[PDB]
Write a protein that binds this ligand. Structure first.
Ligand SMILES: CC(=O)N[C@@H]1[C@@H](O)[C@H](O)[C@@H](CO)O[C@H]1O
Ligand SMILES: *[C@@H]1O[C@H](CO)[C@@H](O)[C@H](O)[C@H]1NC(C)=O
Lengths: 296, 281, 50
């Protein structure tokens, strides 16, 4: 008879990498080595873009008491490319950092800083007792206590409004159970652990859905056509045969997708030209045999 | 500096029909020869668009809301529409965005502005030198703290032109989502008199900005001693976007050529559920 | 003819669903996570496609 057996597949010959022309490094010093951090209820947000980051040196430092990532692995960040990065900086008490992770509730998670449930980023914190806490106590670090209702992720409110925990309305400035919602921490050095002031930085970079700006340090190789190769275009990984195309990408376009959500055209990030992608060959293998009682 | 100009006629609002206008490219992914169903904020077909006009007389620049987007359109000559304010208080306690396509530059600013009641730019008129020259910039008087800023390359636009019927057709779609301000636009010449053109055309994206402000109101800045002036013949139209699924048709060139508004009436809904532009008995 | 074409078409389109994972592309899960966490995601993909 004729029997079907294993399949076959052409194997890739070599690997390609194409990355942008970014040279300048990122302003991490301006974030981690700043003089002054704002209060939790007025956290500060800086936007990082158009540089070449190096997250390894951040991960290899021992200064950090907590370095936890939620949608990526800290090892891989160095070969991923991003569209924009955000840095949120503030200062909190030593034991509330637990509330900052996504999905939990409590004082801070309900009144000061809420993280979405689909968070993709990294949370960093380390205790900075001596640098800012003083025997008199740098009490300008104050947080909110009571609020109208929970605030949605990445919200912020600055106001002098007075709160009425009581039933009756309260006017003027103060009254019976008419509370000024902001309250200052008790930060001073001889205080024990768990009440020390900790500094927190949150990175909330976005993924693989738009023209990217921040890449890691991976250097580009040349371009090879008409051979099964492994390609890596700005973090888009794959395998196939590259070719010169006839599709007329408009200037704002960067990809071309399939019915099954697979890219089948691309634009080279250095020489802006359009390349087709076609997968290598595959097929079955049938063996035709007379009986083994007749011959081998 | 700014003046309260009042000499002009008073009229009630006028309403018109938006046949098949206000469809744009929702993403930056190439697609060709295919029908794709997409959900987003579009301008519904056969909708009621407000109409304002500056003719000879008529000069109305009222505060208009900005809810979940705006489809602005202008049929115009001589480049009279030039500016846009956007803000939530407009009064010195919150930042406001300014876009100005003035004669020399294209300026974009995000500043702690302070405007007044009648902000506007204005060009004098044909004073025997064969040119209209910018002499009026009475928009704002205070600017405290301003984060973003941008001045594009210098240039010179036309400030003259005489014809009874407009040929400049500008469409713009303005969106503000994820703290990002998106501007889509398109230019076209058409032979129209006093209404909105009937036809179909898509809007390629033009700009994104990472601004991050809260906008609830906006106001146009039109091109014009303290009173007495002449209006350029121009009409401009306002409509508002809503969340509504569409079925889009890409041809070989990946060029959007038709759309189906997928809740307009039962026939459109059946076209959606079959994913075709033609249905059989 | 029509019935066969239709069935085959829907089979192909079912490759772009999540089934609850973080992404419908297998190479993004591999190139973003490390093994012990990537397994929990790849497993949902396998169940749905099977
Ligand atoms: C449907 C349609 O007309 N598609 C056009 C085609 O006619 C034209 O020849 C080609 C090059 O201009 O661009 C595309
Ligand atoms: C990127 O750098 C290369 C030099 O290695 C240069 O030839 C190319 O033109 C650059 N492309 C862009 C877009 O800057």
């Amino acid at each position: 008879g004729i029997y079907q057996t294993s399949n076959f597949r052409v194997q890739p010959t070599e690997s390609i990498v194409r990355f942008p022309n970014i040279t300048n490094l990122c302003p991490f010093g301006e974030v981690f080595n700043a003089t002054r951090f704002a209060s939790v209820y007025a956290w500060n947000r800086k936007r990082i873009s158009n540089c070449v980051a190096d997250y390894s040196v951040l991960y290899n430092s021992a200064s950090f008491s907590t370095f936890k990532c939620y949608g990526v692995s800290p090892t891989k960040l160095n070969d991923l490319c991003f569209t924009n990065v955000y840095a949120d900086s503030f200062v909190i008490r030593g034991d509330e950092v637990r509330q900052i992770a996504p999905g939990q509730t409590g004082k801070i998670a309900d009144y000061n800083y809420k993280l979405p449930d689909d968070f993709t980023g990294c949370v960093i914190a380390w205790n900075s007792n001596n640098l800012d806490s003083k025997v008199g106590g740098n009490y300008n670090y104050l947080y909110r206590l009571f609020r109208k209702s929970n605030l949605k992720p990445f919200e912020r409110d600055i106001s002098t409004e007075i709160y009425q925990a009581g039933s009756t309305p309260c006017n003027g400035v103060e009254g019976f159970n008419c509370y000024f919602p902001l309250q200052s921490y008790g930060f001073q050095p001889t205080n024990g652990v768990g009440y020390q002031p900790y500094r927190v930085v949150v990175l909330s970079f976005e993924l693989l859905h738009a023209p990217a700006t921040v890449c890691g340090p991976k250097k580009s190789t040349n371009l090879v056509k008409n051979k099964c190769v492994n390609f890596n275009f700005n973090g888009l990984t794959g395998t196939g045969v590259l070719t010169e195309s006839n599709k007329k990408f408009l200037p704002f376009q960067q990809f071309g997708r399939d019915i099954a959500d697979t890219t089948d055209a691309v634009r080279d990030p250095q020489t802006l030209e359009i390349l087709d992608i076609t997968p290598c060959s595959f097929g079955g293998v049938s063996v035709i045999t007379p009986g083994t009682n007749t011959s081998n | 500096q700014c003046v309260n100009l009042t000499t002009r006629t008073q009229l009630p609002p006028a309403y018109t029909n938006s046949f098949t206008r206000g469809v744009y490219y929702p993403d930056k992914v190439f697609r060709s020869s295919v029908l794709h169903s997409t959900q987003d904020l579009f301008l519904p077909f056969f909708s009621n668009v407000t109409w304002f006009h500056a003719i000879h007389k008529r000069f109305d620049n009222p505060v208009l809301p900005f809810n979940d987007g705006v489809y602005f359109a202008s049929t115009e000559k001589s480049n009279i529409i030039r500016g846009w304010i956007f803000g939530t208080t407009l009064d010195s306690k919150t930042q406001s965005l300014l876009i100005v396509n003035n004669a020399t530059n294209v300026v974009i600013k995000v500043c702690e502005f302070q405007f007044c009641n009648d902000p506007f730019l204005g060009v004098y008129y044909h004073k025997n030198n064969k040119s209209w020259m910018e002499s009026e910039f009475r928009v704002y008087s205070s600017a405290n703290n301003c984060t973003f800023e941008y001045v594009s390359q210098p240039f010179l636009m036309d400030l003259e032109g005489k014809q009874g019927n407009f040929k400049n057709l500008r469409e713009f779609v303005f969106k503000n989502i994820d703290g990002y301000f998106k501007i889509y636009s398109k230019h076209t010449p058409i032979n129209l008199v006093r209404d909105l053109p009937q036809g179909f055309s898509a809007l390629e994206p033009l700009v994104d900005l990472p601004i991050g402000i809260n906008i609830t109101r906006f106001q146009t800045l039109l091109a014009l001693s303290s009173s007495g002036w002449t209006a350029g013949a121009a009409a401009y139209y306002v409509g508002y976007l809503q969340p509504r699924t569409f079925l889009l048709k890409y041809n070989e060139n990946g060029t959007i050529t038709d759309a189906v508004d997928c809740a307009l009436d039962p026939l459109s809904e059946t076209k959606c559920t079959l994913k075709s532009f033609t249905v059989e008995k | 003819v029509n019935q066969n074409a239709q069935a085959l078409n829907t089979l192909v389109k079912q490759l772009s669903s999540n089934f609850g994972a973080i992404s419908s592309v297998l190479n993004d899960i591999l190139s973003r996570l490390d093994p012990p966490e990537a397994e929990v995601q790849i497993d949902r993909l396998i169940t749905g496609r099977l």
